[model samples]
Target chain A: GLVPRGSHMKVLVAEDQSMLRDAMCQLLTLQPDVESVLQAKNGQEAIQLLEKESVDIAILDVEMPVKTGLEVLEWIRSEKLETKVVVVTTFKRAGYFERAVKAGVDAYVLKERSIADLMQTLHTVLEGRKEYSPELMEMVMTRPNPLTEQEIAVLKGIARGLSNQEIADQLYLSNGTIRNYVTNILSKLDAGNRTEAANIAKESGWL
Target chain B: HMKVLVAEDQSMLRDAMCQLLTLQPDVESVLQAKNGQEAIQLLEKESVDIAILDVEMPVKTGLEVLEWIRSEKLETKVVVVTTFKRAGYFERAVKAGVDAYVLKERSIADLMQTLHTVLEGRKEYSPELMEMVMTRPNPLTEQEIAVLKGIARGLSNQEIADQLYLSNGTIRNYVTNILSKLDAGNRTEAANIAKESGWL
Candidate 1:
């Protein structure tokens, strides 16, 4: 049996958006199979809960503050925890999907999917089978992320309206190096400016 | 005995909300729309007592829908639900005569309570939203803000004028006033400043 006899599932939901997090927690707790639901507003709190609780499944949002869902997934795999991860996010980017898969995510669902679909995914993942959103699979097959990890980090800074010097300081790189990265990012994205480049990357789900 | 309309784009939240509303004893029926356009179309035919709108959607924003409802003089009580704490959205919603403004961060119970409060002929706005609006003040007029949006899109003065159906010279004057008001050297700089302040 996937779950032991006379036992219920303990789920941890990690999402940055307060409304969605609260809604998901509320709905999950209403399910007969779910015994108790834990809530985390960010990835950092999610990690804290994972370290202490014997959670069976974790529903994570990809773009959380402090640490991303992917970072949490990596930690779970590194610690060899038996917790099954379900990444629920609005971002349909291939880059995020590829990273989550590499980190051994059990399920990757879209927030736009119905609550019934999400509940079904929770059970399907408990059976040790993997699932992903249909659109995400199509995107992964058709497109690939062109930016490297470091470049993506720089792009994230740009999206936040950070200057090259500020990004350099944050990344512990020289200002000139950040400038070069910005130039290259703009060139590769075929954008005319830093803001334009960031917008293009974000629209394409690169950020 | 109240008919409600839930107009949010996310299917998960929309379905859950519809289910919850249906369970309410006072609710007669609950209608659902995926975006602002559908909400308006449904409103054109149905006489909903209350409408809960999400700020960001595909076809038109919740704020635009609120404006439409007010302009059409619909008796439907409007409630705007949003995840953004932006002062601009809050101010615009208030200006459009919204009945209630609730942040999504609040619990489902809080939202339901707000609906009841609004139905009683009183208005409700989230405390945090009010605090945010108090701190940041936008300096641009509505027309100036429209022009700045065009500038942010890299439109020239004539293009902006044509879109707004104003003369080129009038747009030039507005740009001059915007530069001085925002203390910017050029159109792009002015637009950036406005964007940073959430005025655009």
Candidate 2:
């Protein structure tokens, strides 16, 4: 199905930076199909607007005050809202995308996108196509999640710069489970040590 | 007496920079600003020998503050520091009369060398950055460069398409052209080439 140009569509945008948030609102307002753009300075305010409005598309920044974009995405899925979403960020991370895709976002975008490029993404979503940037596609394709769900939690704990015992405490898992996960992660990543494994994951943009 | 001011929003990094600069033998005092407006206000009231500014900041961007400094014809040396290798900011900093551009990704020791070089009445731009920007036969038009900036920022083709006001397929073709023109190994490299050449 195609959305005709000039058809009314509401957009919700959330970003911490006033300059970017205001520029995005101004740019979206210039689009022929965008009837209005609801603005929020943070993720929590974005969720609030989603609760109050029937926005067709919601563009959320990954980093914001009070809540993160992923948390908002999780909330959106929990609420079963029909609004399409495009999670945007300045940087790419495999861990973030895993969470975003799992939460059912219609698209993922980089904040550096041109105004025109953003509009095209919105059109793609309106046309019922799931879209992701090429970087994200490569992220999903070439580097598929190699770690188990529990192992990933271990990796995340490692990324937090935590020790195995600390991670075990955080995850409520035994010290042995955390240590085994760390050993396996290093093996899978071909890293020489646990610190190297965490570094590899960090450099690889997974955590 | 060498007076320096570091304007970075992140408290941890700002504090670290302040601490490092204070230990320098030539440094008289180190000032700090959490935002751009505060930077400008501080500069107006205080005499700073050098101003290390983060390119992106709240209230006013570092570039805006740089412009203000130049417009007022201040003699303070400026070094624009950024985490991202954005040629846009680099070009703007140069245009705004900044004396140096430094990547925060560089080590603290490397940053000190750049600061010393600038203090020696020399302009400092990363040779690596300049070398990359100089790779020639850039086969991109204005529109293509616009698209490339988005790409270099690590944006997806879909995001680039949205930002460029073009179709996904069209952006793909542009990327293909970009790759061939730059003699880049891939789209990512093409962006790297574009960014290094300061074309993006």
Candidate 3:
């Protein structure tokens, strides 16, 4: 059982897609161990719910309008809450998975998986075990991030459509330094230009 | 009761949507199609009132299917749903005569409202999507756009010229103009920019 035989569990489903969100909510309500289910349309609402309600688990989607699920996971960890986090997303981007792992996510499930798999994941997590999608784990293991922390930061700025000067100002680095970094990034990724380099890194989950 | 078809590749989302559609009192039945090809096959047989299409599907894209529906002169209303905010998709869908264009991120209520609106013979588009399509108009000519697509596919100048039946000199000039227009340093960069802008 999810909650030590007699006790019930309170769950939070945080997803931006309303159709999927409603379906998830309905499915969760049918679970025998679930006491109640709370819903949040965005990451900010998820944080608000986490602050007010004593949720046992928070099932979060990776991308949302107000705040990202990763941001919410960071908040939960920073606040030292005991609520277990489960990341469910359609994107299998290695960058997102790496970040969630670093934030100590209890489980990382893909939205492509069936609801039964999700319920089983919830049970496994509640039992103090970690579960990550096998496909995601395989991807994480096979594809290593090539760029350093600093290079990754610069690449992120580039991905945001920032100019070298803008990125330099944001990172408190010299314009020349930013340019050199960009050149190196383009070379390493074998990209024709900054846009291509960013695209390559993003598709590879390096950014 | 309206007979609707939900054509999405993702099974979980597709099944969930089918379940939700069945709950609607006005919906007589909900048909499921795993991809654009399947949707087309079903459309050939079924008298679907509205076909909700996801743009990025296997076999054939939703846009291609939409074009097919228009070409065949089918009366089935097409509702194009996609996660992409690309201006190219919106403009093309509009040009191909989509009944409604909705972002998947929008609420279910908004989608239902769109369904009703489209069924009433009116069109609906996501306001933000329309604004995006308006702000970034495609600058390239049709010929230039074709060359850009070739470049995106990593085709050589001679190869693209051979396909378009144009001279090498003319193709090279078009390439130069494309690079300049997109403000890109190389063909790859230009192609990437055009793609991100949804021009190709």
Candidate 4:
């Protein structure tokens, strides 16, 4: 019998990589009770679509051409999109987990675990809450989260090979934001300052 | 007013897109088509403004319907949504007169933004495709991407050799290849670039 189509959830996929994006879409098409699955290739595309599409769920990729998934998630959270965000990416770093949580992402799913856990995540997110992958939980247990988004974005900027002033300028925020962000980054990563934050973030795959 | 038809096989995604239409401040309603044949049937019997079609289907492929839509000149907006299968169908779909392309993997925010962007008299491309067009040189090809991952887990030349069960030389060759492609000075830079680029 057909699934009756009562809870058909509308989904949006924002991945830059076509292969992975398509695979996930095909998987969704094969599943039951999904209405429409839309696609966006980057964070800018997703941000551009925010006000126009009446989407229920957003599957956001962390690394995008014009914007980062963290930025998009932050936009969604701050703007109150009323849509759940699922942070989908290939990277499995602790800082991403922290950022996603702060961004109010409904789920954090890594690429390696896509087959086993994506649908489970979709189901869980549909229920008006969140679901963290078990692997993500295991990774989280190894770290603590006291740093804020301001700090992480600074670290994220360094990861992109940006200087502090450059990051502050690009963010269009105060150098104070950058400074505070850096302060938090150093404190949470247990680094003495900016360069160590960069090194630790690099070594941990968080950058 | 344009009457759009949405055809998808997944109940969750399909229904969600449908609900999106209902939620829109502008749209009065949106019709549903569950499969290729069902979509065709709807098009034949009822008028449609746009037809949003999913490419993969057990009953019929979107390409088949794309041909039908073009030949018949149904005067409908046709958007193809498919998972990543390379650019093969994209070329064909464009010639078939798909008003635009939509990826099924993007978030609703993007989809809605794109829909409005398209409808409001603008062109939009998926972020990935645009990057591909701009870069000309994709830093991480699929093969290169695989090797980069192994390198990130603190793997050594000999250690990567043992785990991949390949010769030490092969791992070293991969590392060298990675550094050259990224235009980095050394292993550390390459490692950092690989991690930062999400190629790892």
TM-score of 1: 0.67
lDDT tens readout by residue for model 4, B32-150: 87788888888888877667788876587677777898889876667677665456677677667666676766655565566666566565655665455445444676656666666
Q: Which residues of candidate 4, in runs, are more than 4 Å off?
A: A1-6, A143-207, B1-200
Q: Please give the CA lDDT of all the candidate structures.
A: 0.89, 0.80, 0.88, 0.73
Q: What are the RMSDs of all candidates, in order?
A: 19.2, 30.2, 20.3, 25.0
User: Against the true structure, what is model 3's DockQ?
Assistant: 0.25
Deviation from native of the Cα of residue B101 in model 4, angstroms: 25
Interface RMSD of each: 1.5, 14.7, 2.3, 8.9
All candidates in order of TM-score, best leading: 1, 3, 2, 4
**TM-score of B chain for each model?**
0.68, 0.67, 0.68, 0.60
Worst 10 residues of 1 chain A by lDDT: A1-10
After the best TM-score superposition of candidate 4, give how far the Cα of residue A156 lies from its true spot, in angstroms.
Answer: 39
* Residue-by-residue lDDT tens digits, candidate 1, A1-207: 265511478899998877777777887888888899999999999999988988889889989899999999999889988788999988888889999999889999887898899888888888877898889898777657778887899999988989888999999999999998888888888899999988898899887
How well is each residue in A1-207 modelled by candidate 4, as lDDT tens digits? Answer: 111232688888887865356556756765676778887888888888886877778888898899988998999888887687888776778888888897778888766453436767777777765778678789878755445566667777887788778999988888777887887778778899678788887687564
What would the TM-scores of all predictions be? 0.67, 0.40, 0.61, 0.37
* Candidate 3 clash figure, as a count: 0
Worst 10 residues of 2 chain B by lDDT: B10-19
Chain A TM-score values, per prediction:
0.67, 0.67, 0.67, 0.63
TM-score, prediction 4: 0.37
> fnat, candidate 2?
0.00
Clashing pairs in 1: none
Give a tens-digit lDDT track for model 3, residues B1-200: 78899888876678777777777888999988989999999999988889999999999989999999899999889999888898889999999999999988776677778889999999999899988766756799999999889988989999999999999889999989988888999988898998899887
